[PDB]
Design a protein around this ligand. Structure first.
Ligand SMILES: *[C@@H]1O[C@H](CO[C@@H]2O[C@@H](C)[C@@H](O)[C@@H](O)[C@@H]2O)[C@@H](O[C@@H]2O[C@H](CO)[C@@H](O[C@@H]3O[C@H](CO[C@H]4O[C@H](CO)[C@@H](O)[C@H](O[C@H]5O[C@H](CO)[C@@H](O)[C@H](O)[C@@H]5O)[C@@H]4O)[C@@H](O)[C@H](O)[C@@H]3O)[C@H](O)[C@H]2NC(C)=O)[C@H](O)[C@H]1NC(C)=O
Ligand SMILES: C[C@H](N[C@@H](CCc1ccccc1)C(=O)O)C(=O)N1Cc2ccccc2C[C@H]1C(=O)O
Ligand SMILES: [Cl-]
Ligand SMILES: [Cl-]
Ligand code: NA
Ligand SMILES: [Zn+2]
Length: 570
C-alpha cells in the first residue's frame, strides 16, 4: 500500500521522462520553425502527453493521500492528481490545444506595416522604435499598430480560451484557472501578502512616476503631459511601459556625470551567453553543457524560418539537454534578459536529479529570480567597467535612477497583469469589458493612459506575450521583490559592507553555495524553507528592495518637493 504508492511514482517518473522529452522536442521544433508540418507534429504529441497524463493521473486519484506516510511520495502523488488540460473531454481538449497554438502563432508572426513601405516585427524592429524614438507620432505609430495587429487578432480566441482553461481547472478540483494558478504558491494568504508588498513600494513608485512625468513634460511639451495626470503609455521606452530605463537619457539626474561599446568591441549573442555562463561558474555554480551551445537558438534565424522570438529557457527532462531560444540583440537590456534565461537553465541543472514531479522552483517566483540576481551585479558601473563597456554621489543617484526605471516601474505592471486575469477567470470581467478593465488597472496601478482612445474590437492585453501564451505573470512581481532579498543575503555572505547597491557578487563561492542549496530542493519543500536557507528568514519582504533604493527615495522626495509636484493622478 505504501509500497504500491512507491512503485507507482517510480513508474510515473521513468515513463514521464520519455514522453515529456518527446513533447518538448516537438514543441521546440515548432517554436524554432513555425510551419504546418511542425504544428501537426506538435498537436499530435499533445495527444500523446495527454494520454499519459490521463493514465497516470487517473491512477494517482485512486490513492488516498490522507493515508500516505512518506511525505515525498504523498506530495508527488498529490501533484499527479492534477491532470491540467488532460482532464478535458477529447473534443474540448482538441479545441483548447488548437486555440493555444493559434494564439501563440498569431502573436509571434504579427507585423506592423507602412503602406507602400516596410513591415516591422516586434523583435527587433518595434522594440527598437519604442526604445530609441523621441518623437510622439513615431512612438504612437508603433504603439497603436502593435495593438491593432497583435491585440485585436487575439480577441477572437480569448473567450473560448477562458471557458476551456476554466473547465479544466474545475475538473481538477479548482474553482477557476486563477485559483489553480495561485495554488502554485501553496500560500492561503497569497492575495493579502502580495497586496501588502505592493503597498510598501508605493512611495517609491509614486515619486519615480512624478519625476519622470516632469521630465517627459520638458521634452514632449506642456500640451501633451498633464503634470497632475497619468502618463501616456507610449512614452516610457518599452512597448508595455513595463520597464522605463530606455528613457534614461530624458531623465538623467546629473547630466555632468553601453550599446556602442558592446557593438564596437565585437560582442555577439554567443559572447553575451558566454559572459552569463562565466558569471555562474564564478560563483561555483554549474556551467551549461556542451550540448546547450550546439542546440540552442541564440539569435533570430536569417534563413527565412518564422519563429517564436520571445525569449525562453527549455528543459528536455533527460538531465542533459537544456536550451535557450532568444532572438538576441547586442545591448545591455538583452544581456540582462540573457542572464534571466540562464538562471532558468541553472535551476534546471541544479534540480535535475529529483523526480520530475518535483522539478520546479520552490515557487514560480524563485525560478524567475535566480538569473536576475546575477544581473543586478552585472549592471553595476564597477562590473560594466570590468567588461570595458564603461570608461561620486552624483554617479550613485544616476545609477540608482537607471535601476529604478526598470525595477521599481515594473512593480505595478507585474502586479496588475494577473489581477486582470484572476478577474477574467473568476467571471468578474466579461468579454464586453476586457479592454476597459485592463485600462482601469493600467490607470489605478501604473498611472498610465492610452494615447489614442480605445475602440470596439480592441484587446490590448492580447498584445502582451504572456496573455496569448497563457503564461502566469504574478511570478515576475514575486521575483522583483525576492531578487533584492537574495541580493542582500548573498552580498552579506560575500562579506560586502556599505550600500547594498554597490555590491557585486562576482567570484563569490559563498554566494553561489547559498543559491545552490536552495535550488537543489526543487519543489520538494514548502517555499519558506528555501527562503530561509537563502536569507535567514521565511517571508517575502520589500525591506531589501527598499534598502537598495533608500538613497534614491530620499533624492526623489527632495527633488519632487522643490518642483511642487502633486504625487499620483485622479
Ligand atoms: C520517503 O521517500 C523518499 C523518496 O525515496 C526515493 O524515491 C522512492 C520513489 C523510492 O524509489 C525510494 O527507493 C527512493 O529512495 C526518500 O528520499 C530519498 O532518500 C534517499 C536516501 O536518503 C536519498 O538518496 C540520495 O539520492 C541523492 C540524489 O539521487 C539521485 O541522483 C543520483 C545521482 O545523480 C542517481 O543515482 C539517481 O538519479 C535519478 O533519480 C531521479 C528519481 O528517480 C530521476 O528522476 C532522475 O532522472 C535522476 O537521475 C538518484 O535518485 C544523492 O545525492 C544521495 O547520495 C542519496 O543517495 C534521496 O535523495 C531521497 N529522494 C528524495 C526525492 O528525497 C525519503 O527518505 C523517504 N522518507 C522516509 C522517512 O522513509
Ligand atoms: C523574457 C522573459 N520570457 C519569459 C518566457 C516565459 C515562458 C514560459 C512558458 C512558455 C513560454 C515562455 C521567461 O523567461 O520568464 C519575460 O517574459 N520576462 C522576464 C523579464 C526580463 C527582464 C525584464 C522584465 C521581465 C519580465 C518578463 C517580461 O519580459 O514580461
Ligand atoms: Cl496596453
Ligand atoms: Cl506564477
Ligand atoms: Na514579446
Ligand atoms: Zn523567466
Amino acid at each position: 500500500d505504501e509500497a504500491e504508492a512507491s512503485k507507482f511514482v517510480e513508474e510515473y517518473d521513468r515513463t514521464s521522462q520519455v514522453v515529456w522529452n518527446e513533447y518538448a522536442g516537438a514543441n521546440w521544433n515548432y517554436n524554432t520553425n513555425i510551419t504546418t508540418e511542425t504544428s501537426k507534429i506538435l498537436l499530435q504529441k499533445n495527444m500523446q502527453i495527454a494520454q499519459h497524463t490521463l493514465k497516470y493521473g487517473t491512477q494517482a486519484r485512486k490513492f488516498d493521500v490522507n493515508q500516505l506516510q512518506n511525505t515525498t511520495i504523498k506530495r508527488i502523488i498529490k501533484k499527479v492528481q492534477d491532470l491540467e488540460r488532460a482532464a478535458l473531454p477529447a473534443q474540448e481538449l482538441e479545441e483548447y490545444n488548437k486555440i493555444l497554438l493559434d494564439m501563440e502563432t498569431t502573436y509571434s508572426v504579427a507585423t506592423v506595416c507602412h503602406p507602400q513601405g516596410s513591415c516591422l516585427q516586434l523583435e527587433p524592429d518595434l522594440t527598437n522604435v519604442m526604445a530609441t524614438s523621441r518623437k510622439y507620432e513615431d512612438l504612437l505609430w508603433a504603439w497603436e499598430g502593435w495593438r491593432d495587429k497583435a491585440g485585436r487578432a487575439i480577441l477572437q480566441f480569448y473567450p473560448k480560451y477562458v471557458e476551456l482553461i476554466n473547465q479544466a481547472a474545475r475538473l481538477n478540483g479548482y474553482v477557476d484557472a486563477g485559483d489553480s494558478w495561485r495554488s502554485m504558491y501553496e500560500t492561503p494568504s497569497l492575495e493579502q501578502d502580495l497586496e501588502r508588498l505592493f503597498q510598501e513600494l508605493q512611495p517609491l513608485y509614486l515619486n519615480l512616476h512624478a519625476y519622470v512625468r516632469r521630465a517627459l513634460h520638458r521634452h514632449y511639451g506642456a500640451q501633451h503631459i498633464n503634470l497632475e495626470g497619468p502618463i501616456p503609455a507610449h512614452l516610457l521606452g518599452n512597448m508595455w511601459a513595463q520597464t522605463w530605463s530606455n528613457i534614461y537619457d530624458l531623465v538623467v539626474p546629473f547630466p555632468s556625470a553601453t550599446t556602442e561599446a558592446m557593438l564596437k568591441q565585437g560582442w555577439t549573442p554567443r559572447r553575451m551567453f558566454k559572459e552569463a555562463d562565466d558569471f555562474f561558474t564564478s560563483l561555483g555554480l554549474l556551467p551549461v553543457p556542451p550540448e546547450f551551445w550546439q542546440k540552442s537558438m541564440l539569435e533570430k534565424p536569417t534563413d527565412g524560418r518564422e519563429v517564436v522570438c520571445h525569449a525562453s529557457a527549455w528543459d528536455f527532462y533527460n538531465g542533459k539537454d537544456f536550451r535557450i531560444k532568444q532572438c538576441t540583440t547586442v545591448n545591455l537590456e538583452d544581456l540582462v534578459v540573457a542572464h534571466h534565461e540562464m538562471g532558468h537553465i541553472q535551476y534546471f541543472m541544479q534540480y535535475k536529479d529529483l523526480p520530475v514531479a518535483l522539478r520546479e522552483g520552490a515557487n514560480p517566483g524563485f525560478h524567475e529570480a535566480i538569473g536576475d540576481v546575477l544581473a543586478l551585479s552585472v549592471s553595476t558601473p564597477k562590473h560594466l567597467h570590468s567588461l570595458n563597456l564603461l570608461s561620486s554621489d552624483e554617479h550613485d543617484i544616476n545609477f540608482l535612477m537607471k535601476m529604478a526605471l526598470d525595477k521599481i516601474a515594473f512593480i505595478p505592471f507585474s502586479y496588475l497583469v494577473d489581477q486582470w486575469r484572476w478577474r477574467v477567470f473568476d467571471g468578474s470581467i466579461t468579454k464586453e469589458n476586457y479592454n476597459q478593465e485592463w485600462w482601469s488597472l493600467r490607470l489605478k496601478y501604473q498611472g498610465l493612459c492610452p494615447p489614442v482612445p480605445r475602440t470596439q474590437g480592441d484587446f490590448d492585453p492580447g498584445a502582451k506575450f504572456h496573455i496569448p501564451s497563457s503564461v502566469p505573470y504574478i511570478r515576475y512581481f514575486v521575483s522583483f521583490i525576492i531578487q533584492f532579498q537574495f541580493h542582500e543575503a548573498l552580498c552579506q555572505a560575500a562579506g560586502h559592507t556599505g550600500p547594498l547597491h554597490k555590491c557585486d557578487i562576482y567570484q563569490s563561492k559563498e554566494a553561489g553555495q547559498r543559491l545552490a542549496t536552495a535550488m537543489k530542493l526543487g519543489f520538494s519543500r514548502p517555499w519558506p524553507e528555501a527562503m530561509q536557507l537563502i536569507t535567514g528568514q521565511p517571508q517575502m519582504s520589500a525591506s531589501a528592495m527598499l534598502s537598495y533604493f533608500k538613497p534614491l527615495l530620499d533624492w526623489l522626495r527632495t527633488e519632487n518637493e522643490l518642483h511642487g509636484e502633486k504625487l499620483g493622478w485622479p
